[PDB]
């Protein structure tokens, strides 16, 4: 025992759990999502997973988002794709359109309309 | 492989009742208010950002030690907090046992939670 | 393939690798270090390990820095301050005594460390 | 268990700029940033190496893809960079196949390792 409390996983309701999970895994460079029960499961590096679940309702309102921390080099590579592919993006969590500046950030939506953010935290930030 | 989830926003009816309850259930400080959020920081480089304005089997799950599980579950039971062994809230009154223990419950905003040891 | 380059481990030369590794593991709440070859191994959460190696022979502002919740920070710094462990607010050890937080200190081998927070 | 992360570590070298520039270009990383007394090389797993102005078997080791190993090893071999299969630099001109992966050690005189696991 004696560990400190961790966030281990959270369920995110989206219009299409498979479109959402595939988009997120492919954009962030993660392996193919796993199917578990009603969920499409995406594991992140800091001992936490996102479990996408089908939900036809509204789903996520700004300034809600899930934010992913990546290196400056991965930020440049993902943002370059988030530009050639016509992904809408915003500099702020309230969505402005067309990045944030210690660190950088950019916000965008997945195919289900789930709000995302990629952000950096370089040394000296 | 290296990407981390740094923070996630959780929509609740009242961000302050939810965050304050969770921090005192989990032995965390008094939450910090940042922008429109009530912030709960966890140990694994991630925070939950509660925001004003939960459908089963959705939940937020926390991995904790066996000793903190015993203490939180004791609080739940002595405090009369409804709890279930399953994410569908179909098995009230019990915990579950994958080499670990787990139990599901709701916070005062009706948000679904889970604590687990494995 | 296609992963991005990661720092997987680094070897740190100290007077006593076992005193250093056990001190570090017990202070940061990590499991007991493992012995591998000539090294005492401490694994951290972000897929990187420190391998301590015995060396008769760290200078400021050099250090190894560990990121923790503020809050385990309060718990570890509580140990540092109540236990009389010398500490400084700066990497040059010119400010003894003591957004995010940080504090610098030495392990029993004289290896320079830092614990730091990065809250939302 | 464990949640503590290694966020940065300072590496002592004769010339911080030669080391950081060499490593970033060899590993396919962007240009290093200079901050205070350090030359900063950021890696993907929420950690940075801070070079500041090394004895075998000490080294710094990088986990990389199979494809990046081929490109770095190609640079090493076509570029004449001395390399060894072992951390003691006793097996020159060889790579290791540890754990089904591939690995090689080399000097920049600071000791490095790349591995694919
Ligand atoms: Fe963990
Ligand atoms: Fe989200
Ligand atoms: Fe954010
Ligand atoms: Fe939740
Ligand atoms: Fe769960
Ligand atoms: Fe319920
Ligand atoms: Fe890794
Ligand atoms: Fe160090
Ligand atoms: Fe530092
Ligand atoms: Fe991290
Ligand atoms: Fe090194
Ligand atoms: Fe090595
Ligand atoms: Fe050599």
Disruptive mutation site among C66, C69, C117, C118 for chain B (greatest number of B CBs within 10 Å): C69
Query: Across the interface, do C59 and D27 touch by the CB < 8 Å criterion?
Result: no
Does residue B42 belong to the interface with chain C, where contact is any CB pair within 8 Å?
yes
Query: Measured between CB atoms, does D44 come within 8 Å of chain B?
Result: yes
The answer to whether residues B50 and B13 touch, using CB atoms and an 8 Å cutoff, is: no
Question: Can you tell me the distance from the alpha carbon of D110 to that of D60, in angstroms, rounded to the nearest whole number?
Answer: 8
CA of B61 to the centre of ligand 4 (A): 8
**Ligand 12 center–CA D60 separation, angstroms:** 7
The whole-angstrom separation of Cα D3 and Cα B65 is 13
Q: Which of D7, D55, D115 sits opposite C66 (nearest CB)?
A: D7
B17 Cβ partners below 8 Å, 6+ apart? B107, B108, B109
Nearest CA in chain C to D54: C13
D83 annotated ligand-binding residue: no
Integer-rounded Cα radius of gyration of chain D:
14
Strand partners, D92: D84
Take residue B8 and report the two structure tokens written for it.
């996630």
Rg (CA), chain A: 15
Q: Compute how many other C-beta atoms are within 10 angstroms of the C-beta atom of residue B28.
A: 19
Contact call for residues A25 and A32 (beta carbons, < 8 A): yes
Q: Does B59 touch chain A (CB under 8 A)?
A: yes
Cβ atoms within 10 A of the Cβ of A112, count? 22
Q: Locate tokens 């801070």: which residue? A: D50
How far apart, in whole angstroms, are the C-alpha atoms of residue D18 and residue B107?
56
CA atoms within 13 A on the CB side of D39: 20
End-to-end CA distance of chain A: 34
SS3 B55: coil
Q: Is the peptide bond before D50 cis (omega within 30 degrees of 0)?
A: no
Q: How far from chain centre, in Å, is Cα B14?
A: 15
C93: left (phi over 0), alpha (psi -120 to 50) or beta: left
d(CA A24, CA A33): 9
Virtual torsion, Cα B33, B36, B41, B47, nearest 10 deg? -170
Q: Which three-class secondary structure state does DSSP give residue B103?
A: strand
Expressed in angstroms and rounded, the spacing between residue B25 Cα and the centre of ligand 10 is: 25
* E strand residue ranges, chain B: 4-12, 32-34, 37-42, 46-52, 60-63, 83-84, 102-106, 112-116
Place of tokens 């959460």: C45
B49 contacts B59 by C-beta, under 8 angstroms: no
Alpha helices in chain A (DSSP H): 17-28, 72-84
Rounded to whole angstroms, the Cα distance separating B71 from D82 reads 58
- Give Cβ neighbours of residue B98 (< 8 Å, ≥ 6 apart): B118
For chain D, counts of helices (H) and of strands (E) = 2, 8
In this complex, do D44 and B2 lie within 8 Å of one another by their Cβ atoms? Answer: yes
Q: Which chains touch D (3 or more CB pairs under 8 A)?
A: A, B, C
| Contact (Cβ atoms closer than 8 angstroms) between residue D102 and residue D95 | yes
Q: List chain C residues with CB under 8 Å of A2.
A: 29
| Contact in structure between C83 and C96 (CB atoms under 8 Å) | no
SS3 content of chain D, % helix, strand, coil (to 5): 25, 35, 40
Residues with Cβ–ion distance below 5 A, ligand 12:
D 61, 113
**Measured between alpha carbons, how far is residue C110 from residues C17, C62, D76 in Å?**
11, 11, 36
Q: Residue D74: how many CB atoms within 10 A of its CB? A: 10
* Secondary structure of residue A69 in the 3-state scheme: strand
How many whole angstroms from its chain centre is CA A71? 14
Q: Which of helix, strand or coil describes residue A73? A: helix
The DSSP H or E segment spanning B78 is helix B66-78
Binding residues of C: 6, 9, 18, 35, 47, 58, 63-64, 71, 74, 93, 106, 111, 114, 120
| A28 vs B: CB within 8 A | yes
**Chain center to CA of B22:** 6
The reply to whether A3 touches chain C by the CB within 8 Å rule is yes
Contact C66 D5 (CB under 8 A): yes
Q: Measured between alpha carbons, how far is D53 from B58 in angstroms, rounded to an integer?
A: 52
Residue matched to tokens 């957004």 = C99
CA distances to A28, A72, D84 from A104, rounded to whole Å, are 16, 8, 39
Query: Which ligand does the CA of B7 lie closest to?
Result: 3
Angle separating helix axes C70-82 and C17-28, nearest 10 degrees? 120
* C-alpha distance from C99 to closest chain B C-alpha (Å): 11
- Ligand in closest contact with the CA of C65: 9
Cβ contact (<8 Å) for B41 and C67? no
CB count, 10 Å around CB of A35?
12
| Centre of ligand 13 from the C-alpha of residue B88, in Å | 60
Of D6, D11, D12, the CB nearest to C48: D6
- The span from the CA of D110 to the CA of B103, in Å, is 51
Residue B25, φ and ψ in degrees, nearest 5: -75, -40
- When scoring D29, D42, D43, D45 by the number of chain B Cβ atoms within 10 A, the one with the most, hence best to mutate, is D45
Asked whether the beta carbons of A53 and A38 are under 8 A apart, the reply is yes
Q: Give the three-class secondary structure for B26.
A: helix
DSSP for D16-56, please give it: HHHHHHHHHHHTT--PPEEETTEEEEEETTTEEEEEE---T
Tell me which DSSP letter residue B91 carries: S
Q: What angle do CA C112, C114, C120 make, to 5 degrees?
A: 165
Cβ partners under 8 Å of residue B69, min gap 6? B101, B115, B116, B117
């Amino acid at each position: 025992s004696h560990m400190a409390v961790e966030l281990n996983h959270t369920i995110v309701l989206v219009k299409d759990k498979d479109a959402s999970a595939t988009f997120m895994a492919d954009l962030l460079g993660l392996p193919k999502p796993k199917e578990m029960g009603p969920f499409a499961v995406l594991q992140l590096a800091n001992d936490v997973s996102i479990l996408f679940m089908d939900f036809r309702g509204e789903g996520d309102i700004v300034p809600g988002h899930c934010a992913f921390l990546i290196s400056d080099e991965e930020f440049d590579q993902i943002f370059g794709r988030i530009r050639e592919g016509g992904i809408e993006h915003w500099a702020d969590q309230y969505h402005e359109p067309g990045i944030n500046d210690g660190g950088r950030g950019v916000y965008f939506e997945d195919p289900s309309g789930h709000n995302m953010e990629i952000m950096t935290r370089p040394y000296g930030s």
